[PDB]
Amino acid sequence: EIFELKAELNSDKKEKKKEAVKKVIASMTVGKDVSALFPDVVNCMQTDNLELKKLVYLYLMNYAKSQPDMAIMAVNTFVKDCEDPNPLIRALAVRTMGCIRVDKITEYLCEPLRKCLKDEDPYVRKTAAVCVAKLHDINAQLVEDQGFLDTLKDLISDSNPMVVANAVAALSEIAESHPSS
Amino acid sequence: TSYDYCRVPMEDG
Amino acid sequence: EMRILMVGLDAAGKTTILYKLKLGEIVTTIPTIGFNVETVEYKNISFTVWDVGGLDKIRPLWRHYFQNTQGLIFVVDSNDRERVNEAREELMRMLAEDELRDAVLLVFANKQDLPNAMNAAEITDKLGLHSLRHRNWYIQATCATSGDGLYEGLDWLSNQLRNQK
Amino acid sequence: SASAVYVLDLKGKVLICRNYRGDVDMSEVEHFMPILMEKEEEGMLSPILAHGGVRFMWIKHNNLYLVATSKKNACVSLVFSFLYKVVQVFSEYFKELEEESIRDNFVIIYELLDELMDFGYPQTTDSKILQEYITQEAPRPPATVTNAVSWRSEGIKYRKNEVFLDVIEAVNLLVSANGNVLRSEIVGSIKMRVFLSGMPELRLGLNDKVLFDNTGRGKSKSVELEDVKFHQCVRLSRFENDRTISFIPPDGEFELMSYRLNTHVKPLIWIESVIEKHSHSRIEYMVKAKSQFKRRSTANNVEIHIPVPNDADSPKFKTTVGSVKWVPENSEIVWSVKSFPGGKEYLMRAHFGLPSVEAEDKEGKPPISVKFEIPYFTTSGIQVRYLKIIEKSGYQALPWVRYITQNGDYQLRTQ
Numbered sequence: 145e146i147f148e149l150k151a152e153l154n155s156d157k158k159e160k161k162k163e164a165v166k167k168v169i170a171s172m173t174v175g176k177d178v179s180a181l182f183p184d185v186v187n188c189m190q191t192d193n194l195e196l197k198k199l200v201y202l203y204l205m206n207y208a209k210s211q212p213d214m215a216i217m218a219v220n221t222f223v224k225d226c227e228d229p230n231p232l233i234r235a236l237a238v239r240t241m242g243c244i245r246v247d248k249i250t251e252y253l254c255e256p257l258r259k260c261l262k263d264e265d266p267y268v269r270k271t272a273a274v275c276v277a278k279l280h281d282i283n284a285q286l287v288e289d290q291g292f293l294d295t296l297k298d299l300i301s302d303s304n305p306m307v308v309a310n311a312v313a314a315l316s317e318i319a320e321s322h323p324s325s
Numbered sequence: 326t327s328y329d330y331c332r333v334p335m336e337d338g
Numbered sequence: 339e340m341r342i343l344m345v346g347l348d349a350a351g352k353t354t355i356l357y358k359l360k361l362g363e364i365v366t367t368i369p370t371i372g373f374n375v376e377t378v379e380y381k382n383i384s385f386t387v388w389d390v391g392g393l394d395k396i397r398p399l400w401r402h403y404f405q406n407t408q409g410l411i412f413v414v415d416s417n418d419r420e421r422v423n424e425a426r427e428e429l430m431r432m433l434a435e436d437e438l439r440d441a442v443l444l445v446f447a448n449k450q451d452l453p454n455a456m457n458a459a460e461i462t463d464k465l466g467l468h469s470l471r472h473r474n475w476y477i478q479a480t481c482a483t484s485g486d487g488l489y490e491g492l493d494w495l496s497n498q499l500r501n502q503k
Numbered sequence: 504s505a506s507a508v509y510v511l512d513l514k515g516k517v518l519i520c521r522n523y524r525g526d527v528d529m530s531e532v533e534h535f536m537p538i539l540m541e542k543e544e545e546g547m548l549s550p551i552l553a554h555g556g557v558r559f560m561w562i563k564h565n566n567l568y569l570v571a572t573s574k575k576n577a578c579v580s581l582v583f584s585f586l587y588k589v590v591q592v593f594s595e596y597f598k599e600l601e602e603e604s605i606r607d608n609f610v611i612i613y614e615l616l617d618e619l620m621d622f623g624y625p626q627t628t629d630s631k632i633l634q635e636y637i638t639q640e641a642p643r644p645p646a647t648v649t650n651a652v653s654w655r656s657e658g659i660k661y662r663k664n665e666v667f668l669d670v671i672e673a674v675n676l677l678v679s680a681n682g683n684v685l686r687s688e689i690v691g692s693i694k695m696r697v698f699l700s701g702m703p704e705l706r707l708g709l710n711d712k713v714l715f716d717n718t719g720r721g722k723s724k725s726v727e728l729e730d731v732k733f734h735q736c737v738r739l740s741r742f743e744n745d746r747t748i749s750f751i752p753p754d755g756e757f758e759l760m761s762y763r764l765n766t767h768v769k770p771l772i773w774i775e776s777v778i779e780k781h782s783h784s785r786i787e788y789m790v791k792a793k794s795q796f797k798r799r800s801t802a803n804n805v806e807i808h809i810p811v812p813n814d815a816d817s818p819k820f821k822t823t824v825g826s827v828k829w830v831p832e833n834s835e836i837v838w839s840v841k842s843f844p845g846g847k848e849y850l851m852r853a854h855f856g857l858p859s860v861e862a863e864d865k866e867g868k869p870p871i872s873v874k875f876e877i878p879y880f881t882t883s884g885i886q887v888r889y890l891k892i893i894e895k896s897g898y899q900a901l902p903w904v905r906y907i908t909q910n911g912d913y914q915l916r917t918q
């Protein structure tokens with residue numbers, strides 16, 4: 145029942161893995177326990193097709209809580225996607241990064257988020273400013289140890305006020321979690 | 326809608 | 339249109355030679371916690387290459403790819419004598435499965451720029467590649483920064499994938 | 504500060520789901536519908552339900568519940584305005600939003616629920632700008648998505664340059680059983696349809712009372728706009744300075760401003776109704792509808808609803824002008840007049856029966872509520888004066904307007 149799905153998923157044709165992952169997140173929509181098919185969609189993730197990678201990021205976001213040890217095979221792909229010339233796929237990878245709620249993963253993700261805060265193109269900056277708050281939701285002292293807050297306050301003094309608005313939102317999110325020290 | 330418009334002036338100098 | 343792996347202990351220059359076969363550059367690469375997959379179209383065969391890193395927490399996650407696996411390339415660590423023993427142990431733990439049984443073997447002596455790195459005969463005797471039944475194995479000395487020995491290994495791989503002219 | 508935007512159906516199962524923070528478990532929506540059916544039978548229904556530490560902000564669409572769960576002290580009005588904007592975005596991608604649209608377009612709806620909100624914060628919800636890289640048919644995000652002018656994509660070129668305006672009135676009214684007016688306010692809404700090329704800086708001009716008192720024309724007819732709610736696009740600091748309406752319009756239909764003022768003028772359509780409800784026998788409706796406005800105007804397709812009892816039978820309708828259909832679904836008569844000229848006074852007599860065995864429960868008294876529509880006429884008397892198209896390129900556009908008077912909740916209570 146799922147074995148044909150995995151066999152069609154471990155193919156090499158575009159139209160096979162694309163219909164495979166659409167069938168997967170169609171079964172995820174109706175509420176079927178598709179958590180056991182985790183490490184086979186991760187193999188067919190690195191594609192240049194962008195309508196497909198949103199579905200795989202969706203699967204990585206809805207099923208990293210249930211499979212915490214299996215989700216270690218994604219960090220290289222996110223830190224690869226956070227250097228691509230397309231800014232949409234960078235901000236897509238960045239807002240996919242923080243929602244993965246695994247404590248063992250956030251220790252490696254601090255460097256590309258640090259780079260994307262210092263990016264030029266403001267779309268990925270207004271994504272990464274909220275992703276800082278996503279990361280502070282998981283481990284608060286890790287973000288203070290990495291020193292993102294002093295970099296986060298520098299986007300408040302930036303122009304192009306959407307990055308300013310998301311940075312003020314994230315800072316008000318983090319300062320609510322602090323004891324007001 | 327079967328209703329028709331009325332043009333307005335531009336500058337109102 | 340064949341899949342192929344690149345496994346081995348970490349910091350062995352394997353994603354370096356992967357992106358050297360991909361583009362032809364020597365890129366700055368982090369220690370690969372996850373994995374890389376690209377393809378290299380070469381001699382009318384798309385070499386779909388599956389590099390997996392060699393960190394301690396990601397070695398047991400190699401069995402999740404071993405369902406429907408066709409080929410294998412193992413890359414040694416010639417310059418770390420204290421870790422090549424546990425690299426051989428991870429290899430024989432990988433070679434102790436009846437699931438990956440049809441794959442060919444291809445060993446790359448990598449990072450051949452230091453004088454301390456061994457030749458293409460001593461690594462075989464340290465690993466014991468002769469006593470591996472049903473393993474059509476072959477060794478190759480590869481220098482990562484120059485790119486030598488890579489196309490020869492790909493050509494022997496093409497002679498192993500198809501068994502015809 | 505939402506946590507998980509859920510979209511349910513009328514049975515309570517999940518049509519589509521999208522969590523952001525993980526502070527609310529994905530099985531917490533299973534406690535929504537039993538809690539709603541529990542609160543339904545004690546009159547303590549609320550848009551904010553409560554399950555321990557998980558609150559359920561929800562709205563009701565056609566067949567859909569857009570539950571947005573939260574755990575902490577969420578900014579509630581943020582969540583509800585987000586949910587109605589999500590409704591508007593889905594109804595701008597989809598011609599209707601029903602159960603048949605979620606399970607057939609899940610390719611794009613997960614993308615939208617990933618794009619509109621991250622970590623519980625709305626960040627990009629203008630649907631027309633969002634049509635440019637999230638399509639059902641991908642390039643870089645346009646510069647309009649990041650720039651300060653975030654509702655108008657530069658590079659749109661049309662053949663003509665048409666500026667359409669619809670200054671649509673909506674008379675609210677509430678007349679008590681005594682025959683006196685309790686509340687009478689007009690909620691008007693200028694609704695534009697812009698077909699312009701370039702980056703225009705329009706300057707709409709009204710006959711505002713404050714602008715004329717600060718101008719010096721304080722003896723002509725000027726509307727006292729008691730409150731104005733402009734769109735995002737209007738420069739609000741410049742409006743607070745000198746009542747000036749300056750903006751860069753979006754591309755397509757939108758609602759520019761929503762003015763709201765009171766009315767010391769008589770109601771437009773008056774419903775003088777009498778009810779001879781004899782017990783157990785019958786009921787007579789010697790209702791009349793006079794039009795208090797000017798003789799020239801022509802109220803199109805009005806529908807004067809009058810609520811009847813629940814169990815009426817054998818109708819008889821002695822009218823003068825305009826037919827009567829009897830709708831027992833809503834349990835009311837719909838005295839539909841096709842064209843209702845001003846100054847006239849039309850009489851209508853409805854006559855039902857009533858069952859001789861009495862009812863078991865009470866009935867309730869809904870109000871007489873008309874559905875009128877008057878073109879080319881404003882009750883408020885607002886007059887747009889000018890519309891200065893300002894473009895760096897330089898052309899002449901054709902600004903068109905039309906005035907429609909509608910109803911809002913034009914209710915008249917019964918005895």
Ligand SMILES: Nc1nc2c(ncn2[C@@H]2O[C@H](COP(=O)(O)OP(=O)(O)OP(=O)(O)O)[C@@H](O)[C@H]2O)c(=O)[nH]1
Pocket residue numbers: 347348349350351352353354355366367368369370371390391392393449450451481482483
């Ligand atoms: N001097 C020298 N150093 C090399 C050479 N090849 C690889 N290295 C070093 O070895 C490291 C490993 O190379 P990579 O391929 O980028 O990393 P990897 O082998 O995939 O190891 P993981 O990413 O942890 O899986 C590099 O960072 C280099 O510093 C080489 O030919 N000469």
Ligand SMILES: [Mg+2]
Pocket residue numbers: 352353354367368369370391
């Ligand atoms: Mg690597």
